[PDB]
Amino acid sequence: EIPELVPVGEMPRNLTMTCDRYLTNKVIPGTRVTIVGIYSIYNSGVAIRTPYIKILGIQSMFTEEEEEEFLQLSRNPKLYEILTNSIAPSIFGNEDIKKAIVCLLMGGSKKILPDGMRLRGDINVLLLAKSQLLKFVEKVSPIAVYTSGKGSSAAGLTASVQRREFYLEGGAMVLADGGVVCIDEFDKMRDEDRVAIHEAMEQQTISIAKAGITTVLNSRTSVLAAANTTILSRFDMIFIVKDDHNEERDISIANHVINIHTEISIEKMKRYITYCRLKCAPRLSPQAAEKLSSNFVTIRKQLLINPITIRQLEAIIRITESLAKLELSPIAQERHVDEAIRLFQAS
Amino acid sequence: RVTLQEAPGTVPPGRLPRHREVILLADLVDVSKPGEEVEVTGIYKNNYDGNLNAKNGFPVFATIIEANSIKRSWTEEEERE
Amino acid sequence: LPSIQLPVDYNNLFNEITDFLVTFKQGPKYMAMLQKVANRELNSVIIDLDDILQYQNEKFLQGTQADDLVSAIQQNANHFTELFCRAIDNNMPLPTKEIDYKDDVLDVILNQRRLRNERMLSELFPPNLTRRYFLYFKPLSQNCAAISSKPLSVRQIKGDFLGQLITVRGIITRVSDVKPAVEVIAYTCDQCGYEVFQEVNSRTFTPLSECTSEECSQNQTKGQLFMSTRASKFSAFQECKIQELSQQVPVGHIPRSLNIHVNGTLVRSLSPGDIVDVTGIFLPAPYTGFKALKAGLLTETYLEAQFVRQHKKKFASFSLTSDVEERVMELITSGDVYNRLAKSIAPEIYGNLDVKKALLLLLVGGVDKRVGDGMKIRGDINVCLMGDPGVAKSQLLKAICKISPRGVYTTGKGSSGVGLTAAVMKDPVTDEMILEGGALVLADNGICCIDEFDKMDESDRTAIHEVMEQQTISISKAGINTTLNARTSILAAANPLYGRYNPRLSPLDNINLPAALLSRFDILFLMLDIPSRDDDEKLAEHVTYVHMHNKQPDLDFTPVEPSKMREYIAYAKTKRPVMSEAVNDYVVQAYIRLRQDSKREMDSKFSFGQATPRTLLGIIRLSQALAKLRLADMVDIDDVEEALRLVRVSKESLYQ
Amino acid sequence: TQLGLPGVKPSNSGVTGLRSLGVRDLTYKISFLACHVISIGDQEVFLNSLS
Amino acid sequence: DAVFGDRVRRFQEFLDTFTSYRDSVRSIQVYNSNNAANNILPHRIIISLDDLREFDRSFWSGILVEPAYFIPPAEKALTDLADSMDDVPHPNASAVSSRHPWKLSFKGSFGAHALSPRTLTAQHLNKLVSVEGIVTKTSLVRPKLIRSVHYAAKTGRFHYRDYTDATTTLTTRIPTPAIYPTEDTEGNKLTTEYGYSTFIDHQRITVQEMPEMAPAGQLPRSIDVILDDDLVDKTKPGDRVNVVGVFKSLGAGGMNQSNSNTLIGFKTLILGNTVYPLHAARQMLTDFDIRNINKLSKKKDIFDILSQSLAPSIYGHDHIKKAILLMLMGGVEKNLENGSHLRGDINILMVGDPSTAKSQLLRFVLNTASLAIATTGRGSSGVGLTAAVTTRRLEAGAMVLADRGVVCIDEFDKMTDVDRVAIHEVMEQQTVTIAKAGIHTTLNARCSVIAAANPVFGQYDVNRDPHQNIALPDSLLSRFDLLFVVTDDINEIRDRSISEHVLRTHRYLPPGYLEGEPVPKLVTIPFLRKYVQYAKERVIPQLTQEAINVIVKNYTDLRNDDNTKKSPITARTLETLIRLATAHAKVRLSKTVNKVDAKVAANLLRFALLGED
Amino acid sequence: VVIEAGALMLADNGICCIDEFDKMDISDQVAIHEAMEQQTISIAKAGIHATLNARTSILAAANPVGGRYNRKLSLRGNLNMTAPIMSRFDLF
DNA sequence: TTAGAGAATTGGAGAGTGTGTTTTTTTTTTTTTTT
DNA sequence: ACACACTCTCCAATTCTCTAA
Ligand SMILES: Nc1ncnc2c1ncn2[C@@H]1O[C@H](COP(=O)(O)OP(=O)(O)NP(=O)(O)O)[C@@H](O)[C@H]1O
Ligand SMILES: Nc1ncnc2c1ncn2[C@@H]1O[C@H](COP(=O)(O)OP(=O)(O)NP(=O)(O)O)[C@@H](O)[C@H]1O
Ligand SMILES: [Mg+2]
Ligand SMILES: [Mg+2]
Ligand SMILES: [Zn+2]
Fold first, then answer.
1. In the CATH hierarchy, which top-level class contains the domain C321-650?
2. Domain of residue B59, residue span
3. Contacts of B1 in chain A (CB under 8 A)
4. In 3D, which of C516, E22, E519 has the Cα closest to residue A113?
5. Given an 8 Å threshold on Cβ–Cβ distance, is E380 in contact with A331?
6. Helix, coil or strand: residue C10
7. Å from D11 (CA) to H9 (C1')?
8. What is the effect of changing residue 6 to K (chain B)?
């Protein structure tokens, strides 16, 4: 029965029913429906029988004109500024945070080589006010999962084995496979997850061999996280949130709160992100290769005379590809490399 | 059908509560909810049961109550007050 | 309804059988057995198929054709138990000796019934009622060989084999206790005073309740029948289960098993834990009554046991036939059996001679003792190996695991103290509690090998304390309060603390065992890995030769094979040599010196703890083992000095 | 149960041969058929109770 | 009734026309007849359905839409063909009346009838269908009676009768009561002749749709399959499988009087006709592969070519690649006559700084070995990694599952001490033994171990002892054949070379894609796998005196000379030398180990152990 | 459930004696605490619900931790008993 | 007074018909993952 | 289909009665 019709303090009542031929396989669990059917009884106290119903009726990708708008946006000379401005507009300042979130949403390009090695595409960011941005990322993203550090069950973030025969269940890294996942307090991570997130992030897999269980789980996702150590090495970019205390801002927020108590929109931006993810996967030009290699050896020499490592060069490449992805340019260029290393200053 | 149990206040000290079962017919169904304290009027009735006779080994009949009735705003003066 | 032709006529095979029983010889062989049966001296007849093959070959060489009876009784084995029995009944000779015939109830009953028929006149009863014997087939020798000679694992027994005679290899899982089963039932009619019989084959039957005898009927005497045990025929029955070896299970599968039935004198041959070659007849088990009508065509199946071959002869099965006498005389005449037998243990491992000699003395063991007031003293010997990583400890241990007829191998990490000793499991669905013994019970009267002894948890090692000295287990848990027997000797291996032995500390620091447990080993051997350019070269040459040729390098020495070694050791474990006063004085004087030297040097770096009274009986046990190996009936002082040397050498590794 | 109880099917050895049993078997249990019970474990009512 | 004969005639015409099936019948028959005089092949044949389409469309559609009326006569015609061909005389009693005809199987171009368990629908009942999925359950094998033979005692006549059940025949017949007759029509008492009677095997399984196709987290759906005779036990749970058979219904469906008011439906099954696996490892060589493998082996430096063809996307670390190749080849396992066992498989460990391609290189072995299991060190327990108890039943761990394969352990340093000590048996004795409540058993685990770890201080400290940097006991490090230390030393030209290399790697595009679309000589990996398979199966090099002369000298010099060597040297080092020499000889496809192989093995061990060449 | 009465039910309007209280498991001490708080017992399982009266006074004995009392310490330090249960005894 | 010919009453032999059957704790020993 | 419980039917065994030697 409908939830808004139940009397207070009672659990809802239900019925069982039958259908055949073309009425089969027409609905799925959780959908609200209207039904026409004969009400009758069947055998299964004294002189007493069970009721049921025999059903006789039930009631319950882009176009060209869409992608034209997305193409018009693609050739705007200030699109990067427009997308950064559209992200959490109420939050004051924090420019580079918004830029990093754009790069996280867009992502790099996946690649597979002749010898079978597989190259990652995802992006990972950490943030050290901060509560709002994760909710916004949840809303804008095509697929999103939100959780706090302790997790929804004993699976925690990654996974665990539980007990009577043993079984296994996955946390909020397996469930977010193929999409984005945001963690509200990364410091409240449990002990097992502290070690398991290494494999979850580097390999995009979780593997367990316990109590006769022997399986491997997929963890293909981009992680956003916030807190307030060596665990910072797993992330591509780390930043610290900043605040400003203009009274007009608080007064405006309060006035809006009283109003409810008494630039690109979200849906359009989400569809545009989906379109860009589906249509393009750019490649580095040779000039970018020379630029990046020279910068890499330059920084390592500067540190030597006074660390950078290959695992961070391969992150700078992904950021460069994600920046080139917005323009739908099939090749990345020095323009994107410059902004990539400029935005690389986490520190 | 409804199962009825002695109220805890009525039970003497050091004794377990007793139980009986009540049959509700056309107009009286869903008149009461579990956990309510209820007052019942009806006929006290009995019938043969094979399992009771088999287990106890004596010609022992089972008993049921058939309910006839079941029991458990403001004026303008209250509003003015 | 329909019918077919087949190539076999049973009349010819029956004629062949009755000729074979009266003609064959290696007088004729089987007529002696049937004479013993007639004299009531013998209860069972075992038919060899090797005799039938030899008979066929001899008849062929005489220039005559003959049916291949061997394959005929292998193909359809069930029918021929009846043919042989009928042939034996026909040809049975008369007794040679007086019997006291009146002891038999059936004789009196049948004689009186015959007299009743004789008076009345002025088949009677089923022939199974008077067969005083059992009959079994023994399969073909493989070295003469056919499928019955070639063992099958339990997976290879397909549905094609139903009805045939086969051989199976595996481990027994459980055994039932004996109970009787009816073959012929006897009744008595009250009014007319007449007896009738009924034969039972199926798992169930309906007893008779009306006297249908013609004389009883024609007198219109509707009498009542009553059952009688005193003239019924029973036969002993037992049921077991066999299961495939764990090392033959394919990957990812669960092991399978078969049900075995045993009747007659073959009963209580099998025991749990045995590795065995069973051979028998593989048959189905039909349903009965209303169950059959709605059970479908899927048939249950089992194996009728006929003959059993064990892989290793237990030491208790020994008897000195002249065949074994001739072989032990070889070793006795050759001489110096101690060194040869010690050298023969694991020839592929270089050096380590003293360790091998100690482990031989472990294999032999001391003499059990039981004082007149009821005290008893341990006979078994316990040994421990302590040494650096990579000096063939696990290898030598697992090598000794082969020689012993009863033995088990276990590692420290994979073992629970409960499962190592005995467990009280709530196993059945009926919530019943049942006791099932652990590894040390399965190794009863054998050796138990415990590798990685240092990794086992400190709490679980305490379970071994009772079994080591008292050779028994005591349990008092939910619904169970009993004592079990565990007459087992323990051999163990371990690394010192921190792995490789540390010379900075004393031996007791490196050993890291409590005093109560360190005392319970009769010998603890300390072996260290110290480089040397001379010795390493020799070891490397030996190992490289072994890898090249699969044979130990040899110029002078020939090891005795394991079978003859087992025969010599089994013969040596029967002697019980006694001590003498001259030896007693010597050992008594040695013990004082040992304890004084222990008291002097408890502070010293060369300490190994304090000598308890259990060190005296260790000397006596080792001396008696040495006396056993030379087949003496008297301990000699020569044995005592060797026992003392073998204890002294264990500590010399400390001095580089 | 082993007797002809209406509406119920049949369920150390017993006795047999009786008419109602047919081929069935009958056993028994021991119990006690009592006739009275006595336990051995307002101030005015209490005072009236006393001697 | 008359239509049965004509269909037999038409299929006889088909069998005469397409002659490649006559050769199959004759080859199976002559093979079985040969070894019988001393395994036996089944009496089964697979026909291409396309040939039957091109021969006669009416028979093709009859088979494919009305199998119950067309499959039996064709099978009868095949039995007639095989029976008319010459056969061994004087058959035995059991052979005379076996009741064992030949049987058919199909391949190719099912069209619309290729299905999955989700989409199998009531419209498809009594059609011949093909389904795909994962095996989830398997029943025990049981025998089944179909015929019994009896001997009449008085008359000397052999009698027989037949039995049927709903799952035994495509067509439908009156069921049989499974009773053995005891007495003749003429009153003679009968006896049952086991061994002349015929029984067949029977097994039921269950097949479920693959999890990759499950919609919306909905419950998955599955079908039961019936197998018999030859098809039994050819599958186990977890197998991906494709099954061919007739989809049929059973039973009374409650119309025989029941309390359900007939709301419950009829039961259904698939009668297994043919089973094929799915690859989701093994390959079979053609003649050209043998020619190429033999020709390539005579190059001067095959070892360099093959080693450098392993993981070309990873720059540097030549010696580790060569060690991995020798691991994949392996030594020779020995079993002496007295039952003693000598180890053959090689174990490798590598420890080093962060970011130095340890996990990336370890990942490569998982995708070129024929059988490989991967695990992380902290995500596995000792019992889970070896074996565990359940209900008593004992359940295998990871090292037991990969029996004759390789096991990869990442983050080895995070494994607890309690978990590590379970592994000391498996790496030398190659067995797992359990002694717990109600169980005592031994299991086989013959695999090779390769693993990676981090040093104690986070980066390797040359200014402290190797034991201080590597916190593992000496007894464990002894069991690894080769121990490699690797570090990220900062240098200009090294950094430039590596950075240019990875940048060249990231500019790859696959063949069939335009730019921007979403997705010396080196032998290809699909050829290298064939090379490794052939070399491991077909050549078993034996040792020689000239190799032994090198091995003994190298061992005795290496053990006794005082140096700052980074691993304990024991009797297991000699075995490592022998194994490496044998493996290098196996790379060469040599029937014997020579001096060159021992020299190369010594040079590799010296590099790994003493750190310099 | 078997429902059959426990010890506290038999001691209704009576004295219930607990000997060696300190050895009782915490999981049962909490049950005695819940009964003592209300003088009432509740059952709800397997479709059967019941409430019962437990007007019983408790007399308890316990051992100090370590077997001997410490005059340097409070009774809370000496006794292995949780504070809510200790708060509900009239006399120590 | 015996006995034999005819009629009436009762017993149970035995033939026939219908039927039924397979098939949430609570307490206690032990292994395993989790803090 | 295989033991049971219960019902139905026919036929001859038995005792009673009448008649005459
Ligand atoms: N004297 C020897 N003769 C032959 N092989 C030897 C000898 N000493 C050591 N080995 C070899 O050493 C290897 C390891 O033997 P093993 O029994 O496992 O040693 P271990 O002491 O038990 N190792 P560990 O368990 O770590 O203490 C085997 O391959 C043996 O062949
Ligand atoms: N030639 C190379 N040398 C080093 N790293 C490389 C090389 N080529 C690629 N990489 C990249 O280096 C990164 C680190 O590889 P990885 O195998 O995780 O190192 P690691 O030894 O496992 N570090 P860790 O997980 O902390 O132990 C990956 O992103 C590789 O793609
Ligand atoms: Mg060892
Ligand atoms: Mg890594
Ligand atoms: Zn009689």
1. alpha beta
2. 1-72
3. 45
4. E519
5. no
6. helix
7. 37
8. In allele MCM2-1
